[PDB]
Amino acid sequence: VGSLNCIVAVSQNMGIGKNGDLPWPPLRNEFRYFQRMTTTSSVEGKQNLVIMGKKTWFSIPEKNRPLKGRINLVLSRELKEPPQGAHFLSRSLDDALKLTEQPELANKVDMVWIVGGSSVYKEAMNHPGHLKLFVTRIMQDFESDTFFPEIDLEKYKLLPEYPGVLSDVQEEKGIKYKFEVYEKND
Ligand SMILES: NC(=O)c1ccc[n+]([C@@H]2O[C@H](COP(=O)([O-])OP(=O)(O)OC[C@H]3O[C@@H](n4cnc5c(N)ncnc54)[C@H](OP(=O)(O)O)[C@@H]3O)[C@@H](O)[C@H]2O)c1
Ligand SMILES: Nc1nc(=O)c2nc(CNc3ccc(C(=O)N[C@@H](CCC(=O)O)C(=O)O)cc3)cnc2[nH]1
């Protein structure tokens, strides 16, 4: 019933990861933005669901797992059970989305947030339906081994403004960045 959204922070060269962590040092307010967007439900009494691949799960500091105030679902074709601390395990994105509509989660979940990595971002971005991409543009090149798939800029349109999102250039640790929101309607 809820909205479907991706969220990512990406360097100019399209990098999202390096050696199992982010390519840039911790940007505390950028992380707080990730937290606010993924945690804030549009319905009282419901939580959002975060969907992530297995490497993304383990890249989150253990102290912060599961991500508090959100239902945490990990994608894996190999695991028999969710990793310790995770709430659910699914074998595919479509299986995960189906789970959200079944009775165990139907009255519990509002928004769905896809939080990486590359494969699930690519599949989500091309999935039919209304979809928004919350993209933080890190305005430097960073050496990376994991990349965000190219956004089709005819398919997706940049919203000029977005409620609850700062428009001005931000800067932490000498790294400038800006928050963007893209949308497709089907
Ligand atoms: N900058 C950012 O916004 C951001 C966001 C997310 C991640 N990251 C970074 O990106 C890296 C992790 O991402 P990644 O792309 O390497 O890995 P990932 O997608 O998180 O994990 C890959 C593994 O997840 C499982 N998987 C992925 N998609 C699946 C699907 N659709 N269905 C079933 N299983 C699926 C597979 O595990 P099995 O072999 O067990 O099946 C696969 O080997 C880290 O460096 C992390 O720090 C950055
Ligand atoms: N905008 C954006 N920035 C990111 O850094 C980001 N990272 C990932 C995957 N990596 C991670 C790594 C750590 C945490 C994390 O520890 N978050 C906690 C603490 C946030 C904080 O301290 O401010 C959380 O409660 O969300 C989340 C995602 C996916 N989407 C992103 N999206």
PDB file of N, CA, C and O in Angstrom, residues 1-5 39-49 71 100 105-113:
ATOM      1  N   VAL A   1       0.850  -1.227   0.000  1.00  0.00           N
ATOM      2  CA  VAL A   1       0.000   0.000   0.000  1.00  0.00           C
ATOM      3  C   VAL A   1       0.871   1.258   0.000  1.00  0.00           C
ATOM      4  O   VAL A   1       0.454   2.319  -0.477  1.00  0.00           O
ATOM      5  N   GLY A   2       2.089   1.140   0.516  1.00  0.00           N
ATOM      6  CA  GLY A   2       2.950   2.301   0.666  1.00  0.00           C
ATOM      7  C   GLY A   2       3.814   2.619  -0.549  1.00  0.00           C
ATOM      8  O   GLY A   2       3.859   1.890  -1.539  1.00  0.00           O
ATOM      9  N   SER A   3       4.514   3.736  -0.467  1.00  0.00           N
ATOM     10  CA  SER A   3       5.349   4.166  -1.581  1.00  0.00           C
ATOM     11  C   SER A   3       6.612   3.303  -1.679  1.00  0.00           C
ATOM     12  O   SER A   3       7.030   2.679  -0.698  1.00  0.00           O
ATOM     13  N   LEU A   4       7.184   3.264  -2.885  1.00  0.00           N
ATOM     14  CA  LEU A   4       8.441   2.561  -3.177  1.00  0.00           C
ATOM     15  C   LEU A   4       9.501   3.582  -3.600  1.00  0.00           C
ATOM     16  O   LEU A   4       9.298   4.388  -4.520  1.00  0.00           O
ATOM     17  N   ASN A   5      10.629   3.522  -2.911  1.00  0.00           N
ATOM     18  CA  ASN A   5      11.676   4.542  -2.977  1.00  0.00           C
ATOM     19  C   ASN A   5      13.043   3.886  -2.933  1.00  0.00           C
ATOM     20  O   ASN A   5      13.220   2.857  -2.276  1.00  0.00           O
ATOM     21  N   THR A  39      13.344   6.309   8.082  1.00  0.00           N
ATOM     22  CA  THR A  39      12.591   6.014   9.303  1.00  0.00           C
ATOM     23  C   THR A  39      11.211   6.680   9.304  1.00  0.00           C
ATOM     24  O   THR A  39      10.275   6.155   9.885  1.00  0.00           O
ATOM     25  N   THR A  40      11.061   7.833   8.671  1.00  0.00           N
ATOM     26  CA  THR A  40       9.828   8.599   8.844  1.00  0.00           C
ATOM     27  C   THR A  40       8.679   7.985   8.061  1.00  0.00           C
ATOM     28  O   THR A  40       8.661   7.987   6.839  1.00  0.00           O
ATOM     29  N   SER A  41       7.710   7.445   8.793  1.00  0.00           N
ATOM     30  CA  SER A  41       6.495   6.892   8.214  1.00  0.00           C
ATOM     31  C   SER A  41       5.458   7.971   7.932  1.00  0.00           C
ATOM     32  O   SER A  41       5.369   8.957   8.657  1.00  0.00           O
ATOM     33  N   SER A  42       4.655   7.770   6.891  1.00  0.00           N
ATOM     34  CA  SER A  42       3.528   8.648   6.590  1.00  0.00           C
ATOM     35  C   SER A  42       2.234   8.238   7.299  1.00  0.00           C
ATOM     36  O   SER A  42       1.220   8.899   7.147  1.00  0.00           O
ATOM     37  N   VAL A  43       2.288   7.149   8.065  1.00  0.00           N
ATOM     38  CA  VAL A  43       1.127   6.604   8.769  1.00  0.00           C
ATOM     39  C   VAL A  43       1.497   6.311  10.216  1.00  0.00           C
ATOM     40  O   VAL A  43       2.424   5.547  10.480  1.00  0.00           O
ATOM     41  N   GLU A  44       0.762   6.903  11.152  1.00  0.00           N
ATOM     42  CA  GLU A  44       0.987   6.643  12.560  1.00  0.00           C
ATOM     43  C   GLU A  44       0.760   5.164  12.830  1.00  0.00           C
ATOM     44  O   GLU A  44      -0.177   4.562  12.299  1.00  0.00           O
ATOM     45  N   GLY A  45       1.639   4.582  13.637  1.00  0.00           N
ATOM     46  CA  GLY A  45       1.520   3.190  14.037  1.00  0.00           C
ATOM     47  C   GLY A  45       2.180   2.208  13.089  1.00  0.00           C
ATOM     48  O   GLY A  45       2.175   1.002  13.346  1.00  0.00           O
ATOM     49  N   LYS A  46       2.750   2.711  11.995  1.00  0.00           N
ATOM     50  CA  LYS A  46       3.438   1.849  11.041  1.00  0.00           C
ATOM     51  C   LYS A  46       4.902   2.250  10.945  1.00  0.00           C
ATOM     52  O   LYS A  46       5.241   3.395  11.223  1.00  0.00           O
ATOM     53  N   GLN A  47       5.752   1.297  10.562  1.00  0.00           N
ATOM     54  CA  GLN A  47       7.167   1.551  10.291  1.00  0.00           C
ATOM     55  C   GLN A  47       7.413   1.375   8.801  1.00  0.00           C
ATOM     56  O   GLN A  47       6.643   0.733   8.096  1.00  0.00           O
ATOM     57  N   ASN A  48       8.499   1.955   8.315  1.00  0.00           N
ATOM     58  CA  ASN A  48       8.944   1.679   6.972  1.00  0.00           C
ATOM     59  C   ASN A  48       9.778   0.401   6.956  1.00  0.00           C
ATOM     60  O   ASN A  48      10.328  -0.002   7.980  1.00  0.00           O
ATOM     61  N   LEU A  49       9.875  -0.201   5.777  1.00  0.00           N
ATOM     62  CA  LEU A  49      10.722  -1.359   5.519  1.00  0.00           C
ATOM     63  C   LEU A  49      11.936  -0.935   4.712  1.00  0.00           C
ATOM     64  O   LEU A  49      11.788  -0.218   3.713  1.00  0.00           O
ATOM     65  N   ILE A  71      11.744  -1.853   9.763  1.00  0.00           N
ATOM     66  CA  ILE A  71      11.790  -3.296   9.554  1.00  0.00           C
ATOM     67  C   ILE A  71      12.893  -3.581   8.534  1.00  0.00           C
ATOM     68  O   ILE A  71      12.907  -2.977   7.453  1.00  0.00           O
ATOM     69  N   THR A 100       5.574  -7.740   1.791  1.00  0.00           N
ATOM     70  CA  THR A 100       5.068  -6.529   2.437  1.00  0.00           C
ATOM     71  C   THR A 100       3.557  -6.432   2.358  1.00  0.00           C
ATOM     72  O   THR A 100       2.936  -5.744   3.164  1.00  0.00           O
ATOM     73  N   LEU A 105       3.004  -8.459   7.312  1.00  0.00           N
ATOM     74  CA  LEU A 105       3.527  -7.091   7.207  1.00  0.00           C
ATOM     75  C   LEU A 105       2.529  -6.026   6.746  1.00  0.00           C
ATOM     76  O   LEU A 105       2.807  -4.825   6.862  1.00  0.00           O
ATOM     77  N   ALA A 106       1.376  -6.440   6.235  1.00  0.00           N
ATOM     78  CA  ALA A 106       0.422  -5.491   5.650  1.00  0.00           C
ATOM     79  C   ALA A 106       0.012  -4.371   6.603  1.00  0.00           C
ATOM     80  O   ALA A 106      -0.132  -3.215   6.183  1.00  0.00           O
ATOM     81  N   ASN A 107      -0.175  -4.703   7.877  1.00  0.00           N
ATOM     82  CA  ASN A 107      -0.606  -3.713   8.865  1.00  0.00           C
ATOM     83  C   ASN A 107       0.560  -3.130   9.650  1.00  0.00           C
ATOM     84  O   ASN A 107       0.356  -2.394  10.624  1.00  0.00           O
ATOM     85  N   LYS A 108       1.777  -3.443   9.213  1.00  0.00           N
ATOM     86  CA  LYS A 108       2.980  -3.051   9.934  1.00  0.00           C
ATOM     87  C   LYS A 108       3.863  -2.098   9.130  1.00  0.00           C
ATOM     88  O   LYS A 108       4.550  -1.277   9.714  1.00  0.00           O
ATOM     89  N   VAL A 109       3.814  -2.210   7.807  1.00  0.00           N
ATOM     90  CA  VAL A 109       4.741  -1.499   6.925  1.00  0.00           C
ATOM     91  C   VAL A 109       4.041  -0.384   6.162  1.00  0.00           C
ATOM     92  O   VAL A 109       2.962  -0.587   5.586  1.00  0.00           O
ATOM     93  N   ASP A 110       4.661   0.797   6.157  1.00  0.00           N
ATOM     94  CA  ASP A 110       4.230   1.894   5.279  1.00  0.00           C
ATOM     95  C   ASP A 110       5.124   1.946   4.039  1.00  0.00           C
ATOM     96  O   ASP A 110       4.877   1.218   3.087  1.00  0.00           O
ATOM     97  N   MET A 111       6.160   2.793   4.034  1.00  0.00           N
ATOM     98  CA  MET A 111       7.001   2.913   2.838  1.00  0.00           C
ATOM     99  C   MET A 111       7.998   1.785   2.743  1.00  0.00           C
ATOM    100  O   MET A 111       8.417   1.226   3.771  1.00  0.00           O
ATOM    101  N   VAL A 112       8.403   1.486   1.507  1.00  0.00           N
ATOM    102  CA  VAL A 112       9.522   0.594   1.251  1.00  0.00           C
ATOM    103  C   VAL A 112      10.684   1.425   0.696  1.00  0.00           C
ATOM    104  O   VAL A 112      10.508   2.186  -0.254  1.00  0.00           O
ATOM    105  N   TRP A 113      11.848   1.270   1.328  1.00  0.00           N
ATOM    106  CA  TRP A 113      13.095   1.933   0.920  1.00  0.00           C
ATOM    107  C   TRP A 113      14.113   0.888   0.488  1.00  0.00           C
ATOM    108  O   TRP A 113      14.470   0.010   1.272  1.00  0.00           O
TER     109      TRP A 113
END
